[PDB]
Amino acid sequence: RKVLISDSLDPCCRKILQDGGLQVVEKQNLSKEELIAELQDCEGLIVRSATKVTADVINAAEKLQVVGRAGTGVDNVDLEAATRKGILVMNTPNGNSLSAAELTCGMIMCLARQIPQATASMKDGKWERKKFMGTELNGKTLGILGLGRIGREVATRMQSFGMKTIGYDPIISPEVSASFGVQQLPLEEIWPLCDFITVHTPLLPSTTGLLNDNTFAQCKKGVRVVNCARGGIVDEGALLRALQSGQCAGAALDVFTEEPPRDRALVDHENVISCPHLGASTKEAQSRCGEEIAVQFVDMVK
Amino acid sequence: LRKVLISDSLDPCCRKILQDGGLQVVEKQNLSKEELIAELQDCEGLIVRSATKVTADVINAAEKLQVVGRAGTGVDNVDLEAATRKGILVMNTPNGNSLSAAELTCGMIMCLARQIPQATASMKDGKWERKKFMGTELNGKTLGILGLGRIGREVATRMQSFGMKTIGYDPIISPEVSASFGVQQLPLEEIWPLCDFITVHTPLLPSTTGLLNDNTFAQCKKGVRVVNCARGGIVDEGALLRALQSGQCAGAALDVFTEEPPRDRALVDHENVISCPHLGASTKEAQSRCGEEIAVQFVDMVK
Ligand SMILES: Cn1c(C(=O)NC2(c3ccc([C@H](C(=O)O)c4cccnc4)cc3)COC2)cc2c(Cl)c(Cl)ccc21
Ligand SMILES: Cn1c(C(=O)NC2(c3ccc([C@H](C(=O)O)c4cccnc4)cc3)COC2)cc2c(Cl)c(Cl)ccc21
């Protein structure tokens, strides 16, 4: 009967909760001990990416029955510690997909034409039309690794620019991938066909370092890569050397191993487009998330 | 009618198809005015990109110059008055460009929606502000396309796939044909207030110069965003500047300027302006198609 929203979340969350009929507490940038103390009579907790629901927090929260996350994934909640105290963890699987898919297509275009590089150049007062030569997407081959919701939204968009969408996903059948115009192949057959590769998988052991020194070497010379999913699906170290060799012509990253990143080797490279994790950074999405999570809480109050 | 000079960095395949046709060629680069004239003194033809400027003076010092080709669309770097006076032919390559321009345009729109160039310049400076850079979901938003030519319809079919409403205006193409690639046509006065995004794909005309001006900008939605990848001044540079400063315009993307390169560095420098040194036709894919399509035209008239 009492929830706490611990992060900057769309107003409409708190509304639909009270609308449902339970107390709420909008707080922000709270400290670990400040959080626990506030939590000590709250049945629910909703969080964004800021709040980290550690082992310690869950065990200091004697009343905590449920932990909702207004976003995609739960990479900021101890699931081991969660399942131990029989706690529920709630998610917002739909209401974020589109925003992430768009930023991704942004990246691909931005990579093809070096728009961010040209702006930073022009902004410094330089007219370098001698050499900023980019690529026509029409008739090029894009490789999508992770034919989830985001993966298929990215595919249908970049289809319209006349790109070949070949991809790989071990859950989805060739019959269903084909049904949104992505032809499926085994990984070893994908690397050499691609001029562009984007990744849309959760961070798993089966996925970690999916692009590494070894895959990068099987790729077309001057392939270009977009990580808007999770940090490390593309091995950060590995990419760095692929850019330095020219095996990789350029790369776009919305996500890092450390967030925010200490290893500022990549960001700083002249062929790296970067963003401080903006895949869900839209009024449109956070409202749909914030709405879809607050529903799930009220839904189970019957 | 039998010896040509290529004065710019042009795709190798140009010189090939020329000699292939059966006439001498001279691939030179970054030539000086007097260095050019001297080299030209036994060349019937000249092929150029955007770099070389075929001034009044050059044409009149070139007693043998019969023809001037341009590997691109437009010839805003050749004195046409001085050209027609000496009975010289001027050729260009209007086709081999459309797609490259359409893509950069969609680039701009996304880049504007999500501030990708701003985020890179920020990250590149070592900054993580995710609380700051809230952008827009294109899904269900309205794009206004002014100039439903080739480029205009390629831009429309692409941004449709993101789930945008494509309303546009073009006085040449009928509502019946615009509708047939998913652009609903409306009179200009009724377009400004519906748009969250406006791009322009028209030639430079007096009827189109300053198409976006203090007056149109004011009838737009507060925080509209604008893309000029067509010609400098279709969007009044001065007018835009004040629209960004007021917030009537939330941001702008420019591939084209009144002066190229631009002296008035007021716009470029604004924090919500994405800018490019005229890269709409800056793709290996296009310059080859241009370079190929021009060398054809030269050989075609040799028989
Ligand atoms: C488990 N797994 C998946 C996978 O999880 N695929 C499915 C999937 C479902 C939902 C998503 C999410 C989504 O699209 O909503 C998603 C996208 C991007 C980042 N994080 C989450 C992603 C993938 C399709 O049914 C499940 C792809 C995948 C790949 Cl490409 C490899 Cl190589 C290894 C393991 C993999
Ligand atoms: C002459 N004219 C046209 C016009 O020429 N429209 C058509 C057109 C055809 C071809 C183009 C060209 C093209 O799309 O390739 C073009 C685009 C951008 C820059 N330079 C040339 C532009 C427009 C559509 O069928 C012809 C639109 C137009 C408009 Cl919207 C105004 Cl407001 C004033 C005069 C105008």
PDB file of C-alpha atoms and ligand atoms in Angstrom, chain A residues 145-146 148-150 168-172 200-202 204 206-207 210 229-230, ligand 1:
ATOM      1  CA  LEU A 145      22.511  -9.208 -34.077  1.00  0.00           C
ATOM      2  CA  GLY A 146      19.446  -9.549 -31.775  1.00  0.00           C
ATOM      3  CA  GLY A 148      14.042  -8.746 -30.528  1.00  0.00           C
ATOM      4  CA  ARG A 149      11.583  -5.798 -30.690  1.00  0.00           C
ATOM      5  CA  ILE A 150      14.297  -3.041 -31.088  1.00  0.00           C
ATOM      6  CA  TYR A 168      21.421 -13.593 -36.356  1.00  0.00           C
ATOM      7  CA  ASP A 169      19.337 -14.509 -33.264  1.00  0.00           C
ATOM      8  CA  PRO A 170      19.370 -17.993 -31.670  1.00  0.00           C
ATOM      9  CA  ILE A 171      15.803 -17.652 -30.166  1.00  0.00           C
ATOM     10  CA  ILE A 172      13.836 -16.441 -33.259  1.00  0.00           C
ATOM     11  CA  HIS A 200      20.374  -5.492 -30.023  1.00  0.00           C
ATOM     12  CA  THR A 201      20.838  -8.304 -27.417  1.00  0.00           C
ATOM     13  CA  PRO A 202      20.745  -8.286 -23.585  1.00  0.00           C
ATOM     14  CA  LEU A 204      24.662 -12.367 -21.350  1.00  0.00           C
ATOM     15  CA  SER A 206      26.481 -15.984 -24.813  1.00  0.00           C
ATOM     16  CA  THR A 207      26.647 -12.287 -25.969  1.00  0.00           C
ATOM     17  CA  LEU A 210      30.373 -10.884 -29.428  1.00  0.00           C
ATOM     18  CA  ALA A 229      22.090  -2.044 -26.490  1.00  0.00           C
ATOM     19  CA  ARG A 230      24.496  -2.942 -23.606  1.00  0.00           C
TER      20      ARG A 230
HETATM   21  C1  LIG C   1      19.348 -14.680 -25.651  1.00  0.00           C
HETATM   22  N1  LIG C   1      19.762 -14.012 -26.917  1.00  0.00           N
HETATM   23  C2  LIG C   1      18.963 -13.210 -27.658  1.00  0.00           C
HETATM   24  C3  LIG C   1      17.561 -12.856 -27.317  1.00  0.00           C
HETATM   25  O1  LIG C   1      17.295 -12.652 -26.139  1.00  0.00           O
HETATM   26  N2  LIG C   1      16.650 -12.726 -28.286  1.00  0.00           N
HETATM   27  C4  LIG C   1      15.308 -12.271 -27.996  1.00  0.00           C
HETATM   28  C5  LIG C   1      15.286 -10.837 -27.515  1.00  0.00           C
HETATM   29  C6  LIG C   1      14.152 -10.319 -26.891  1.00  0.00           C
HETATM   30  C7  LIG C   1      14.153  -9.005 -26.446  1.00  0.00           C
HETATM   31  C8  LIG C   1      15.273  -8.189 -26.609  1.00  0.00           C
HETATM   32  C9  LIG C   1      15.151  -6.802 -26.100  1.00  0.00           C
HETATM   33  C10 LIG C   1      14.142  -6.060 -26.954  1.00  0.00           C
HETATM   34  O2  LIG C   1      14.306  -6.004 -28.197  1.00  0.00           O
HETATM   35  O3  LIG C   1      13.149  -5.536 -26.391  1.00  0.00           O
HETATM   36  C11 LIG C   1      16.459  -6.100 -26.027  1.00  0.00           C
HETATM   37  C12 LIG C   1      17.092  -5.572 -27.153  1.00  0.00           C
HETATM   38  C13 LIG C   1      18.311  -4.924 -27.003  1.00  0.00           C
HETATM   39  C14 LIG C   1      18.880  -4.813 -25.734  1.00  0.00           C
HETATM   40  N3  LIG C   1      18.248  -5.327 -24.669  1.00  0.00           N
HETATM   41  C15 LIG C   1      17.069  -5.958 -24.783  1.00  0.00           C
HETATM   42  C16 LIG C   1      16.417  -8.693 -27.231  1.00  0.00           C
HETATM   43  C17 LIG C   1      16.416 -10.011 -27.679  1.00  0.00           C
HETATM   44  C18 LIG C   1      14.301 -12.580 -29.081  1.00  0.00           C
HETATM   45  O4  LIG C   1      13.608 -13.473 -28.198  1.00  0.00           O
HETATM   46  C19 LIG C   1      14.523 -13.238 -27.122  1.00  0.00           C
HETATM   47  C20 LIG C   1      19.683 -12.770 -28.751  1.00  0.00           C
HETATM   48  C21 LIG C   1      20.963 -13.360 -28.636  1.00  0.00           C
HETATM   49  C22 LIG C   1      22.103 -13.302 -29.427  1.00  0.00           C
HETATM   50 CL1  LIG C   1      22.204 -12.354 -30.945  1.00  0.00          CL
HETATM   51  C23 LIG C   1      23.231 -13.995 -29.059  1.00  0.00           C
HETATM   52 CL2  LIG C   1      24.663 -13.865 -30.122  1.00  0.00          CL
HETATM   53  C24 LIG C   1      23.252 -14.763 -27.905  1.00  0.00           C
HETATM   54  C25 LIG C   1      22.117 -14.832 -27.111  1.00  0.00           C
HETATM   55  C26 LIG C   1      20.978 -14.128 -27.482  1.00  0.00           C
END
